[PDB]
Amino acid sequence: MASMERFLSVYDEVQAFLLDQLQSKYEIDPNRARYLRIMMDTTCLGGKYFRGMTVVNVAEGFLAVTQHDEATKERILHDACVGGWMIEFLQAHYLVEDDIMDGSVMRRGKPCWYRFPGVTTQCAINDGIILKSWTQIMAWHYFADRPFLKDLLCLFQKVDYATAVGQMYDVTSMCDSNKLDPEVAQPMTTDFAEFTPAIYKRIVKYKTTFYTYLLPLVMGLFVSEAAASVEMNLVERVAHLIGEYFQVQDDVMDCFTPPEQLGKVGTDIEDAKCSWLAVTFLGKANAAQVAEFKANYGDKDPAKVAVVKRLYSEANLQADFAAYEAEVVREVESLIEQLKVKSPTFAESVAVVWEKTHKRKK
Amino acid sequence: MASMERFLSVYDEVQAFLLDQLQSKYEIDPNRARYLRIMMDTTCLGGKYFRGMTVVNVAEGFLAVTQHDEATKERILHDACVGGWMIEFLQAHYLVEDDIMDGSVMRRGKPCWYRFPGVTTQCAINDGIILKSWTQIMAWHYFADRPFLKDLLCLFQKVDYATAVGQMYDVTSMCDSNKLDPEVAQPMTTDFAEFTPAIYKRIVKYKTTFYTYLLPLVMGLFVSEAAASVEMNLVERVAHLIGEYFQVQDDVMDCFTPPEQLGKVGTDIEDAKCSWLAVTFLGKANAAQVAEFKANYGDKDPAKVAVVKRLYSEANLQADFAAYEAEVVREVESLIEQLKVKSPTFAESVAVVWEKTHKRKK
Ligand SMILES: O=P(O)(O)C(O)(C[n+]1cccc(-c2ccccc2)c1)P(=O)(O)O
Ligand SMILES: O=P(O)(O)C(O)(C[n+]1cccc(-c2ccccc2)c1)P(=O)(O)O
Ligand SMILES: C=C(C)CCOP(=O)(O)OP(=O)(O)O
Ligand SMILES: C=C(C)CCOP(=O)(O)OP(=O)(O)O
Ligand SMILES: [Mg+2]
Ligand SMILES: [Mg+2]
Ligand SMILES: [Mg+2]
Ligand SMILES: [Mg+2]
Ligand SMILES: [Mg+2]
Ligand SMILES: [Mg+2]
Structure with a gap:
């Protein structure tokens, strides 16, 4: 519970990075930023975080038995969080697209993304493409010199x-x-x-x-x-x-x-x-x-x-x-x-x- | 014309690599191999190859003024071809998905991929995902130690x-x-x-x-x-x-x-x-x-x-x-x-x- 809140604080940092880069580098306007923030929230959150949290538990396990400086502990945990979110965003991509192909109606207790009235297949297809591009944007940003x-x-x-x-x-x-x-x-x-x-x-x-x-x-x-x-x-x-x-x-x-x-x-x-x-x-x-x-x-x-x-x-x-x-x-x-x-x-x-x-x- | 046939011979090598790897590593059966070969042909060929051929013309230009061994000339031309095809496959991805979102009917003189009777939106969405994954598979295969x-x-x-x-x-x-x-x-x-x-x-x-x-x-x-x-x-x-x-x-x-x-x-x-x-x-x-x-x-x-x-x-x-x-x-x-x-x-x-x-x- 506490650890999951810590995983989620890394989602917030990542969301912030991605959305500020859209404003500073991709000429985005506030309303499309908002739409993309809601898309990200709706497609990436609300699950069990099983895939993300596994990266983190693997890393925690090695940390208990391996000598490191405190700073290095902290970096390792933060990278495991970023890595975890790459995998959640990847899943988010697959599910948005899967729900279109399976003609599905509900997902994580809500309508599938494509069924949101202000979304439709037309926007959802490309939204799912964005979720995947984000995995790579994250990797190159946070892991450039790892x-x-x-x-x-x-x-x-x-x-x-x-x-x-x-x-x-x-x-x-x-x-x-x-x-x-x-x-x-x-x-x-x-x-x-x-x-x-x-x-x-x-x-x-x-x-x-x-x-x-x-x-x-x-x-x-x-x-x-x-x-x-x-x-x-x-x-x-x-x-x-x-x-x-x-x-x-x-x-x-x-x-x-x-x-x-x-x-x-x-x-x-x-x-x-x-x-x-x-x-x-x-x-x-x-x-x-x-x-x-x-x-x-x-x-x-x-x-x-x-x-x-x-x-x-x-x-x-x-x-x-x-x-x-x-x-x-x-x-x-x-x-x-x-x-x-x-x-x-x-x-x-x-x-x-x-x-x-x-x-x-x- | 002759140079374009040479660009296309590199498509054939790439197609062969990708499809044999599907058989040797992804447990594919002949019929799905065939479907994927036809998808690749239909979505990647028939255009002007303007993006691909640019990579190659850029490279040819540097070759005319730069001293290299013959072997190195040949590698450079082949890499420019692979690089070109990465960009064509990328475009192929965008167009398959674009045609779905624009409700389009025809593309390069034929029905849009999703309109093929044996395709439909259901298969086409994921087919377009495959076209993009192929760009990366190519890059890592042919450029691993560049x-x-x-x-x-x-x-x-x-x-x-x-x-x-x-x-x-x-x-x-x-x-x-x-x-x-x-x-x-x-x-x-x-x-x-x-x-x-x-x-x-x-x-x-x-x-x-x-x-x-x-x-x-x-x-x-x-x-x-x-x-x-x-x-x-x-x-x-x-x-x-x-x-x-x-x-x-x-x-x-x-x-x-x-x-x-x-x-x-x-x-x-x-x-x-x-x-x-x-x-x-x-x-x-x-x-x-x-x-x-x-x-x-x-x-x-x-x-x-x-x-x-x-x-x-x-x-x-x-x-x-x-x-x-x-x-x-x-x-x-x-x-x-x-x-x-x-x-x-x-x-x-x-x-x-x-x-x-x-x-x-x-
Ligand atoms: O539709 P499935 O297969 O039963 C489900 O489990 C989706 N899922 C699982 C694994 C992979 C993917 C997937 C992979 C690539 C592209 C689309 C979907 C989907 P769902 O019950 O949540 O709908
Ligand atoms: O639909 P457009 O925009 O007019 C076309 O030129 C497609 N196109 C061009 C550039 C980018 C993309 C594109 C990029 C990402 C995802 C989907 C499409 C599409 P078309 O006239 O051939 O249909
Ligand atoms: C069966 C698979 C692979 C798709 C659903 O995965 P989950 O059941 O883990 O879905 P979320 O937890 O992400 O909602
Ligand atoms: C306008 C754009 C960017 C999409 C079509 O590109 P082309 O007109 O080059 O399409 P093909 O040659 O690949 O058919
Ligand atoms: Mg499904
Ligand atoms: Mg499915
Ligand atoms: Mg299922
Ligand atoms: Mg179009
Ligand atoms: Mg368009
Ligand atoms: Mg147009």
């Missing part, structure tokens, strides 16, 4: 790219691969042959895990100058594991958590998404269940949607989930043990990240 | 940001500033008070000049290691001047060039754009002309649009244009003369850039 600058940019960009590739895997997950063709309007799949665990796994590996887990963790290492002190293949394997589970939870909540609690309203059934629920159901259903799933999936019709939920409850998926969670707890503990060998501190940081995720309710 | 890497990235990013800020100035140019408010649906301006030369100038400075002129020119200097050899304040002043004129031509052509020749269809009148034509007309019109302009501007109605064109032809704007062109020829020559002092070669490169622009018909 040793980790080049490594951080290069990583940030590879993570952004994988994420965008992931979003392509996601937005085309309901069409048949052999039919993808810019020239031909795309029909929803009728056989659901590509609703498989491996295909699902590729969607999720790219669209969520790099930017939600790999980036904040390695970012925490960069600003700590601690990345040579870990086994990177382990960091990857653990980001990919927890990241996958994180997205599985997102999928279950889309169907089962009231929006009242969730803060977004779920579109996966209507959007015909290759979600965990749809893949898992099709891996256990009998012939008649499959036939009725195929009869109602991917239509915006309330009673079709309700038939899918019923088939999901009947297949007892909220116990396939428990079985999957159980295999994940196993594998995460095992990876944490393997990380303990070169860095107890980073292993603990990961234990904390796993814990925050496992207990997640939104 | 001395100019850091300078180039930093410049590229500041230019991208200014451009995005410019696009915000553009997409809000028809509303009153004091009324911009995310919460309130935005009405078109009724007084046209902000349709002024200074306001127009700010739109254009940001949205076109950085990325169309400043970037390719300084890029040509980076890959040549020649940037200390110029007066950068002059490079800026000349990019901003020719860039402004470039956009003025774009505005006139939107109204007056048949789409048959233009390769896009014009939306400025219907979109209520603060174009050069609308600003210039309002700077010379009598009270009754202003009243009738305000009666018909910014409606998608064919006969309202036709009344604006008629008022434009009656105000003899295609002679305000000639007067403006004449002041621009003056000022460009003067800047070229001033550049002659430290680099005849770069001055000549600019003379060529001015020439290609001045003679432009699309």
Whole structure:
């Protein structure tokens, strides 16, 4: 709570930097400054700050065991905060744009940015472009003479790219691969042959895990100058594991958590998404269940949607989930043990990240 | 012609690199590779390559007067080509996204990408995100151990940001500033008070000049290691001047060039754009002309649009244009003369850039 207020005081400094630079260098007028301040506030705040706060917890962990001057402590914490906000702004970018592509209605308990009456798709698209440019403006401003600058940019960009590739895997997950063709309007799949665990796994590996887990963790290492002190293949394997589970939870909540609690309203059934629920159901259903799933999936019709939920409850998926969670707890503990060998501190940081995720309710 | 085929052979190498990396590192399947190849071809090719080819002409100019080994010549030309393609891919990004926000129908003689039947806004938004990520993937791949890497990235990013800020100035140019408010649906301006030369100038400075002129020119200097050899304040002043004129031509052509020749269809009148034509007309019109302009501007109605064109032809704007062109020829020559002092070669490169622009018909 106190630490989160400190993370937010760094948001305020960053907002101030960005907005004063708009006035001093980009000829902005007060009203457009205001619009951009409100956009930044609306798209970047109100979340859990899980990605940002991870950078900071990684850095705090190394600080407890590493000798530094006070001044250097303070710089390290401040950089971890800036780094954290780069990742939040990056997420803010993805969500503004994602909400347009998913035809979404609510986000963090409010309308999606593009649905604000004075915004619309026309302004929102470019607003999301601005959120991303801001990540880079921050990096070059606050990290210009840090040793980790080049490594951080290069990583940030590879993570952004994988994420965008992931979003392509996601937005085309309901069409048949052999039919993808810019020239031909795309029909929803009728056989659901590509609703498989491996295909699902590729969607999720790219669209969520790099930017939600790999980036904040390695970012925490960069600003700590601690990345040579870990086994990177382990960091990857653990980001990919927890990241996958994180997205599985997102999928279950889309169907089962009231929006009242969730803060977004779920579109996966209507959007015909290759979600965990749809893949898992099709891996256990009998012939008649499959036939009725195929009869109602991917239509915006309330009673079709309700038939899918019923088939999901009947297949007892909220116990396939428990079985999957159980295999994940196993594998995460095992990876944490393997990380303990070169860095107890980073292993603990990961234990904390796993814990925050496992207990997640939104 | 031969040189342009050589620029295009570097596009093919780049396309091949990017697409093989998708297969070897991002788990892509052949059909999505194909979709991305067609997207890249459709959004990046078919233009004039003016921005890309400028990087290359800048570099060629320095090569004629600078001693190098043959191998070093060849590397320099190849880097200028890669650099050029970074700028084309960047433009490709902006146009895909711009066409969505302007509700545009045609581009480079074909439907806008988002209008392809098998694309739609849903895929196009993210496709445009990919085009931009590719610029960075290229830079880090082909320029990893070049001395100019850091300078180039930093410049590229500041230019991208200014451009995005410019696009915000553009997409809000028809509303009153004091009324911009995310919460309130935005009405078109009724007084046209902000349709002024200074306001127009700010739109254009940001949205076109950085990325169309400043970037390719300084890029040509980076890959040549020649940037200390110029007066950068002059490079800026000349990019901003020719860039402004470039956009003025774009505005006139939107109204007056048949789409048959233009390769896009014009939306400025219907979109209520603060174009050069609308600003210039309002700077010379009598009270009754202003009243009738305000009666018909910014409606998608064919006969309202036709009344604006008629008022434009009656105000003899295609002679305000000639007067403006004449002041621009003056000022460009003067800047070229001033550049002659430290680099005849770069001055000549600019003379060529001015020439290609001045003679432009699309
Ligand atoms: O739409 P998704 O996939 O279920 C959600 O989790 C968005 N998300 C997660 C990861 C990545 C991205 C993403 C990445 C790039 C571009 C757009 C979105 C979106 P949502 O439930 O909050 O809508
Ligand atoms: O729409 P404009 O402004 O008239 C055009 O020239 C696009 N353009 C030029 C410069 C910058 C950008 C731009 C920059 C950032 C984001 C979107 C577009 C667009 P068009 O006539 O080809 O449509
Ligand atoms: C599933 C993913 C990757 C998108 C949502 O991430 P969060 O659920 O962390 O959203 P916010 O906390 O930022 O609101
Ligand atoms: C006016 C601007 C800045 C956008 C169009 O640029 P071009 O007219 O050069 O478009 P292409 O050559 O790339 O088609
Ligand atoms: Mg979504
Ligand atoms: Mg999505
Ligand atoms: Mg979701
Ligand atoms: Mg346009
Ligand atoms: Mg535009
Ligand atoms: Mg135009």
